[PDB]
Design a protein around this ligand. Structure first.
Ligand SMILES: CC(C)(COP(=O)(O)OP(=O)(O)OC[C@H]1O[C@@H](n2cnc3c(N)ncnc32)[C@H](O)[C@@H]1OP(=O)(O)O)[C@@H](O)C(=O)NCCC(=O)NCCS
Ligand SMILES: CC(C)(COP(=O)(O)OP(=O)(O)OC[C@H]1O[C@@H](n2cnc3c(N)ncnc32)[C@H](O)[C@@H]1OP(=O)(O)O)[C@@H](O)C(=O)NCCC(=O)NCCS
Lengths: 382, 382
């Protein structure tokens, strides 16, 4: 036991990202969406969708699904037709392939041989299968057949926080472990035409985009060959009081359906200070403008309400809002994109640490429960 | 970091099991199965299914699905009709409820307050949903809202080994952590009528049953208040060479379909010696009759081929064969039932350890990949 284990904290050693090449601009999206679903006669519904997209603070999203694919799969354009098998035909191939794109970029930054990856954690909310995306990615990358795998399916938007919590315990308990974490999302599972009876589906179609992110996590980094980016200090999870049914998602004959209450930004903002105190009181930290912020960009209302309740300067949410602007809500992958934006912009602006010059940081994932996952991070010098 | 972590090995502190009350005897099952699926005109197929049931070495299985439920859900009785929503309506309720039955039993054996459970790992192969079964069980048991959860969906028959590997790293890396692990399986997702085009489906219908198992895992057991049952020494995982496509499962519009090659018992038995050497050579153990055996009872051919290739005395597989006889193949739950049978029959026969009087043991999970998971165990004195 005593020398089977690592000594130091789990550390992010590399981050990489990938998105589908196909880019949909938000400014023209209501026209596109109502045209390809043959729903232009639903004029009041289209005006509601236009207001949602104008308020989204999204400039563009990357989507694997193209009009050519929608023309070949018309049942996906209906609101609620039997379509799971046609959706799985796309997502069970594209989720591992997008993850491979991200993982290759992480592994290139890390610079170590594939044989040094001991563990793989793969997270998605886009389809399920056996063997899973973890097995498919093992095959695509040429990982060791002895790689220890964790397949995290149907996770939702806190999944990016969950894979870091998992990688922390693996990296710290196993000397020499190097964990590859990959989050990969393809919205072909959930895309459907609009309907007056499901206005919360319309909100999902204004926000959700595709993407994959990957990191290499290890404890006891090699002084010469590896370069720390962030340390993972602590990980917590809670179910919010009075939140039953706020965010539900069902995998059905008609694909993935989303059930989203208007109460979500309120429920999160009412409970976020208690999550901060629980994570930071043991470290003697109380000033929420003195830490860097990695907030899951679930939508602009969640970030606005948290900023207002906690009293943040507009700088604190900048990295989260840049990801929302350039990619939308990529479910489990989003927080790894925010970490990557933050460390790259910190170096580019000549700041002293990977966390915008701050030492301590917080990462928040939000999803069904309503669940809030809270990680404490430490930056490293630039 | 050095304050945050436990000292000793992750230990099983309690094990509990539960099955649906409804019991189907194997002797009469071909008549039942062909009658409730209205398939009596398929004479040749029924004779083939009779031979599979006679060779199964299964005396009975527990099944939530009853004839009354099958009468109300006729599309579940067809071979391949649209039926996922009807199957999910059963399994998304019954999986957490059967898990609750097992978890209550484990918690009673342990005797500590519910507030001492810090982590929950829930594994199933029977349906997916958001929030998941882990959330539903937290609600059913009244676990703390701060319980850190891992939801392991669409795992398959190595999932029982996987939750123990996860619990080992959590329990060892987190001082005071107590992990509730729960595996719960309901075959309503996969049950379907017979077809001459899918003989591997027929094999699934001869073998798979319903069941849930739970354990409490912790490191540094309290001298006065806790009593270890097994120690978790090491956990490995490998993909077998030349095994592509041996075991596939798809979640489709028609529910969960299984694709099973006749090659499976050969592939496992040809690679098991190497898995034993990898796990035990570092402990200086070479004699496979000197260790206790927890083998996933995937079917009688796997146990027979492993026993013959490795040269085991018939005593070694007794606990695995007893679980196969009394419950059939309960996917991810099966190995925890075997651990429970082994420790109970060891005490009843007055043996010196919970592992049939042996010090060291091996647990094997088998599933899609083809994946073999290998855990080294240590017994405790009786
Ligand atoms: C969608 C969003 C960008 C709109 O911005 P906003 O400042 O609230 O703008 P408004 O309040 O004017 O809302 C625009 C329209 O969206 C509708 N809307 C917003 N949230 C909705 C929901 N959950 N269900 C149904 N309609 C919703 C409003 O009713 C309004 O319809 P109307 O103009 O016909 O009355 C914003 O509400 C948001 O970020 N919410 C998402 C939070 C969330 O749940 N994200 C997590 C995803 S898991
Ligand atoms: C099915 C089983 C219980 C009985 O088979 P057995 O002891 O080999 O006896 P037999 O060879 O007479 O098998 C009976 C029939 O099963 C058929 N069968 C066995 N495995 C099969 C498979 N994977 N696909 C199709 N048919 C299969 C045989 O072809 C035979 O058909 P027949 O009687 O018309 O010739 C045994 O093969 C077994 O335990 N197999 C392991 C199944 C497995 O992979 N388990 C893990 C599932 S994850």
């Amino acid at each position: 036991r005593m020398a089977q284990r690592a000594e130091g904290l789990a550390t992010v050693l590399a981050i990489g990202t990938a998105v589908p090449a196909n880019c949909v601009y938000q400014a023209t999206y209501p026209d596109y969406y109502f045209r390809v679903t043959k729903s232009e006669h639903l004029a009041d519904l289209k005006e509601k969708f236009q207001r949602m997209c104008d308020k989204s603070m999204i400039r563009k999203r990357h989507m694997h699904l193209t009009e050519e694919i929608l023309i070949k799969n018309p049942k996906i354009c209906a609101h609620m037709e039997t379509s799971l098998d046609a959706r799985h035909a796309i997502a069970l191939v594209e989720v591992p392939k997008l993850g491979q794109g991200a993982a290759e970029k992480a592994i290139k930054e890390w610079g170590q041989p594939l044989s040094k990856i001991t563990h793989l954690v793969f997270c998605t909310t886009s389809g399920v299968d056996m063997p899973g995306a973890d097995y498919q990615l093992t095959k695509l990358l040429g990982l060791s057949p002895t790689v220890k795998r964790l397949m995290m399916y149907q996770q939702g938007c806190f999944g990016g926080a969950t894979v870091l919590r998992l990688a922390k315990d693996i990296a710290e308990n196993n000397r020499g472990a190097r964990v590859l974490v990959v989050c990969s999302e393809i919205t072909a599972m959930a895309f459907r035409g609009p309907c007056k009876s499901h206005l919360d589906s319309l909100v999902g179609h204004a926000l959700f985009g595709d993407g994959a992110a990957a990191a290499i996590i290890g404890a006891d980094p090699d002084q010469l060959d590896e370069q720390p980016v962030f340390q993972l200090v602590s990980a917590s999870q809670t179910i919010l009081p009075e939140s039953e049914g706020a965010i539900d998602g069902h995998l059905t004959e008609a694909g993935l359906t989303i059930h989203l209450l208007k109460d979500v930004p309120g429920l999160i903002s009412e409970n976020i200070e208690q999550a901060l105190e629980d994570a930071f009181e043991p470290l003697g930290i109380h000033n929420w403008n003195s830490i860097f912020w990695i907030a899951h960009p679930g939508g602009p209302a969640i970030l606005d309400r948290v900023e207002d309740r906690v009293g943040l300067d507009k700088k604190r949410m900048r990295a989260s809002r840049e990801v929302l602007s350039e990619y939308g809500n990529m479910s489990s992958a989003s927080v790894l994109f925010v970490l990557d934006v933050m460390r790259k912009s910190s170096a580019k602006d000549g700041l002293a640490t990977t966390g915008e010059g701050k030492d301590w940081g917080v990462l928040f994932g939000f999803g069904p429960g309503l669940t809030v996952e809270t990680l404490v991070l430490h930056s490293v010098p630039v």
